[PDB]
Amino acid sequence: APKFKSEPGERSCAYDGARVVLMPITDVIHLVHGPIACAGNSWDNRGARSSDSQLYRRGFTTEMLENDVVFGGEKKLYRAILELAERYEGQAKAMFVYATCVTAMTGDDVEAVCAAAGKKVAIPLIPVNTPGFIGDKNIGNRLAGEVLFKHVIGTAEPPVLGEYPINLIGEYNIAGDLWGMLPLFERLGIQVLSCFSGDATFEELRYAHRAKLNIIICSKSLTNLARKMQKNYGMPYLEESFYGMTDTAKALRDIARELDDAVGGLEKRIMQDRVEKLLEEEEATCRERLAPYRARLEGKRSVLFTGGVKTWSMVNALRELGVEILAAGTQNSTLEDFYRMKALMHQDARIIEDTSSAGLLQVMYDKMPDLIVAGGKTKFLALKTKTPFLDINHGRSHPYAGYEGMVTFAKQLDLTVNNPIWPVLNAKAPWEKTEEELTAAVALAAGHARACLDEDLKDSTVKVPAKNATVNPQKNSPALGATLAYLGIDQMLALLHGAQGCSTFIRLQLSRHFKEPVALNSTAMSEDTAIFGGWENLKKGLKKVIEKFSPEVVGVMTSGLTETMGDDVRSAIVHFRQEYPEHDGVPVVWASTPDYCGSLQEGYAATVEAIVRSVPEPGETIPGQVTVLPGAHLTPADVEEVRELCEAFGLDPIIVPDIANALDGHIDETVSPLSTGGVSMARIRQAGQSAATLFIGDSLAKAAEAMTERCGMPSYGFTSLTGLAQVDRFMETLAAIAGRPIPEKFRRWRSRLMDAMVDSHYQFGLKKVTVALEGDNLKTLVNFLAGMGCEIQAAIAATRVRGLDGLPARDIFVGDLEDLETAARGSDLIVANSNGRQAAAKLGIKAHLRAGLPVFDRLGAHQKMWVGYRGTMNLLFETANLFQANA
Amino acid sequence: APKFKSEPGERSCAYDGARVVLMPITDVIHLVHGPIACAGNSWDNRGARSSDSQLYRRGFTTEMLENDVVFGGEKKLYRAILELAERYEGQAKAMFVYATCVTAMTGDDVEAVCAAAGKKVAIPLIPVNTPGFIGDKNIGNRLAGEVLFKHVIGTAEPPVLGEYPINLIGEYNIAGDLWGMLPLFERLGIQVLSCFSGDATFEELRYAHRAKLNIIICSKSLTNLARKMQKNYGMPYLEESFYGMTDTAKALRDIARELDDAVGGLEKRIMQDRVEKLLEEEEATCRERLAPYRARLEGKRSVLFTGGVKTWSMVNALRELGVEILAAGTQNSTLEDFYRMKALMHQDARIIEDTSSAGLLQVMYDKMPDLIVAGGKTKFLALKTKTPFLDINHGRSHPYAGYEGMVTFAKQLDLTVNNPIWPVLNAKAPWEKTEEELTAAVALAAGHARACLDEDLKDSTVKVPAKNATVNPQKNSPALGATLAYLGIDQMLALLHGAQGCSTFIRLQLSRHFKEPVALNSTAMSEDTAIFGGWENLKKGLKKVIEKFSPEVVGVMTSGLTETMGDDVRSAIVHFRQEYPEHDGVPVVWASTPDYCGSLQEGYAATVEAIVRSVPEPGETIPGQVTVLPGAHLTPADVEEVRELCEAFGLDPIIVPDIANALDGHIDETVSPLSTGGVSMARIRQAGQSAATLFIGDSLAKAAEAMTERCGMPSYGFTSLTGLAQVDRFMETLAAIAGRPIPEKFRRWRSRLMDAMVDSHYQFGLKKVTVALEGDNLKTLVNFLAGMGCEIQAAIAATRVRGLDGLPARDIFVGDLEDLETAARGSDLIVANSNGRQAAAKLGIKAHLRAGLPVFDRLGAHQKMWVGYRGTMNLLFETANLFQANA
């Protein structure tokens, strides 16, 4: 129950009321006479929007200082008025001066200085004298209404006077609220002569005495203004609200009755007939539109802490949406509104009385509601409880009044309630779930390898591409992936058994992506060498490269033509080994990466498998050692923090190949032609004695099998390391392997990730997002985005991989970037490589997320970090920032 | 010396030559008949730009597959031609089909399929039959010229035939190169009848047989075309280049002579007179423009590895810029061009012959040049040596030919050579500099506190603000900083002795910035309490808050009015302690934060000083413990990694206040009204026994003094922790305190930061950037941006602080955001808080960097991480990405 004095240790100052009633006026200068704390940290905070000069959104302050406090601040206000009038001529029609606590203490007379400066300026000055300490926000509202009636109403006559004029009193146009009801008011004939304190011109506001009916939306702020206008002008008021459908229907019907009283009689029911016609048509359409949302929003519990008239109206609206109220409490409302809400408040719903944070926490922990529709104060206090929240206040950024506003309200309610993140957040944490679920998750991770391998390519509802001319191919050569994995080995250069031209566009692409040199030497093959036998060139190139650069190991990969005429690299390898025994000490790893076999991902997987099957040998079972085979999707930073996470549990990680140290970008003391930085051959040889194997890519599964049978280690697989659900499984596997509990830093990062998820899920709801990436880095991004609310319009894959059908999206198919812009229609986010920028230019989608390879137009792509809890937080924040910027 | 066969173990395939001569044609379809590696990783890579349909930038591939290789690929090409003609009707006038190595091996006849499909389409088909293996890029260039002459030249007549027509042969319009010479050619009367293979329409290209003079820029690619056109049409050629001023002058003079020969006689010197007039005027203007750059670019050494005609021309241009050549080697050039360059090559300059990476490294280590102007291959090979580099190739993104192009060339040369990052990068690293410099740097850090404190505010050339009406104030209440520092203490809520309205807009601002709840309770003071004595309310509020929330410590901060009437909080504190001895166990910290005293920074510093002077007590000198007083500018992530860096050296860090754990955003198991997460009172009490004190803010210096005399610990200060120069000093201080060498991870991160600096300095050169931030976070950003090349147009400070004059910028002053948009004119980057977004909307500056407080429109601001080597890398990458996006 409202109890309008106060006890020390909630209601703001009277300046807050003055600004909440006067700031929404657009083309005026709101000069605040006082120190910083009054206007320094409060300007541009009001949720009022406008389609006008937008002069109100900028804040004006006199900047009360040291000397002028003990001398006087009237002269500073004089200069401020004069300068603001002179400089902002043509953009300001009036200006409001607000008295503050310090101004009142100093004895500054706002009225006197305003009268003194009035004669010297052509812009009217309104002396709002509302010191902050004189009361709560209600005193400020009343004083603002007083000054509005005294100095604004009754000064100019309207140029056009519609035969049915009404005044909107108490509506402040928060996030387009006014623009939802305005299309209804002029459609049926009424003219909004003056909408008070919202999207309102000052001259437009001075027309309010020539109307015939007043509509009071917020009773709390401007009821005294309505009463005084009734007393002085014979203007009947009407207390209604526009939040809902039945409430708006009743409001419009009452408006029609009171309009038909004042102009003509109730007989010749001119207004009522059109009001009923519009009501019937628009209500039928709105119900048809709202039906799909109610089914998903039926039976959910609700608790509301809303101050003003919304408390009465929203309870109706929620009740017609298909939800019931468990608790309802208001701090900022009239006693009549409280009693009316209590009348609406059904039994078994208890009215809150403690409006403080402690009382709110009590009622939230007691009622245990699903959704809480409350104010800005209880905004983050309810998110910490991990329950859906909807904000209906100045900070709200959506229109909720009117029929279209009600549709938007239901959309936002479904956005915040049915988000797929709430069950994940409410799930039991790794540090407290009992041991049987830990073993089940560990066994699931262990068997993920065979689950991925067993899935057949034939039974796949995603379609085999059947395009002849593909334009803008997002695929890359598998030789690119072979070179990528070869660069991850310390002191080694890659020998491309190709045609000397494939060396270009492979070295060049990697150089433009990672911004680092690539060696990538090639054995030149001309037309003469293509005919007869092509394995002379392999021996010649091996001899030349060993005699020139002296590598300790050589990686040989095949190109398209070398598979077209089908020379076996291994026979040339054994021949070269036999002819020159002096080169026995330098091993060679050969991997078949034909160009019809797929894209960078398969090439990477195949060369990793070739490395695994050849170099390491089975020995002892030294515990505390784990072997990680990173996928092609992980950037060097991801591999570096995979190493960091492995070291956190005390385990010794061996990463094969080590992209994190070679292609990350490092200025060593001396530049060498070979690729240095990766894992040495001793480490890759001793990696076969590890106690466990982890692979962070689906395509790596086969490689894991290649080490399961050769040495005997158990394998563990994770298709992604993002989304707080896969990172948890990674933590479980790491804890099981190491045998020690998760460190505290990971618990802290999980808490931070939860806080990021709760504070950012509003921008990830029902956003149409398209993704066009490789076989991997597409599952990760799709599962992360679809796991946060966004529905994937199209998940376009570079090549066919196992488990593509399980992705949550409308359609999955394999296609180029042409499929991307022919399928990204009506989408706001594109997740594709940099080369897809053209598609954005064709569709006007300004939100492009650079993922995968290649990314050349954005620097730091190789350092892009999206692994673990911290990487998940970084990706979430980047995507949320893109959503905020593009809209 | 060029040596046009090749040895296995550089020249690309013939398809690269075909594309380098044919791809720059804009409105054609470049269908590549082959597997992925030919066009999958090469499309949209050519540097040719256009002002036309831009159909060339998208790549077309037939996608040779498994079965069709062993069956046949002609039918796939047939379908591809048909589909591309049907779908892209209206955007394509012609289309080129390229034969690849796999296509040639399979025996596919491009000519036969093109002839078969010609009758069924209205778009001409050009069968470019250049298999990759048949030779190097030169064979591809010759074959492309052959097919251009055979199938393009001599098919249609020009609609308009200027009396002086010329053909531009061998110019490909790399980054607006053509658009620098085009304004000169039509100004003096000549008509460019056909510019070959650059910004050229196909129909426009078929007009080339009706000209009278040929200009050959690149002799290597299209000299055979010029010779054949001379043989078949009587068209004299002219081998010149347009890189330079004297070279362009000679080219234009020769053009005038050869034009006056063919149309009329040399007598009536119509062309020569206007050519000489334009040459004189434009050369005088260009020399006047170029003079300022030569002074900064005089005497610098240079080494060039450029392939084509640029080798001859740029040597001239560089020589006229004021630099000399130490070594010059070309791989892709004619023997005549090589001999001509050698003739230009002065003595003591030795021509390189080994064009491989090893030879380039040899010559770079031997000559030791300052600047290297070389190709895309040697791009990152020369950046690792830490020497300035300028790219003149397809990857170059600037026009360098013509007079305006030469001005741009000098601008880019000065950008890459005189960057202030090269001396920093070449400076000796922390792990190798000897001990006297280590001691000097440590002593400088120790004395930084007194250096900052000793600087007087009176001797400061930055100006005392003298504005009456300040609009859009970027300042915040010092009570905001007091609350910020109070939130960093575990299990404590802040009591605001104010007027119950300042509680709003302080709690609300922090809540909108950090997206976390703020307790911030206030002792309500009305008009009656303002008169008489206001210290009854302090006792009442303290009693209420202690009896309700039961805190273990209470932070009391004063507001503006409480200083206007001047009640002493401490007398009320002692009175409250006396009246209720039961509350003895709960200490209270009081800090005077009046609202005329400054902004958030000073409030934070003052409350930190109040906490330091009261809670801790001097005890033992337990080694290995360090005390860190973070500044108000550091976000929670910065404090968290300050802790991480301190723990890396084995030191135990005590952070006061601990923002990194309270306001970072964490979903704890239970929501409490008090602010939890910070440092406990036991830790803050035992922090007085540390072996060293570190402060990361200038304003914190006084606080450090407050702990220097109370306990006796030496102090160390760092005004910033970004830029690789201050992080180094931080590492030196940490190593000196701990007594152990820097770990390897920091060395790796320093190498990565160096690589980021070398690869991103091109976007930070001569970029006009404006900064409007607090006293701190402005020195850091200004020193980082000015330390990377950008010149600061205006460094606008929220309030006057010590050492403001030393910032590198044109003008420093204290002002609001109005000063920001009145001073950010002609700037491309704005570094200000989120509330300055309006200024961007007024100036069209789309690159806005959200720094400082408040930042509400971008999520994750509190997690924004700009500390240490990794934070410096993150900030560098974010700023570079903004520069790339906004331009």
Ligand code: SF4
């Ligand atoms: S296959 Fe032939 S044409 Fe294609 S990239 Fe390799 S060398 Fe060049």
Ligand code: SF4
């Ligand atoms: S000084 Fe007075 S008017 Fe200003 S914010 Fe505080 S209570 Fe409100």
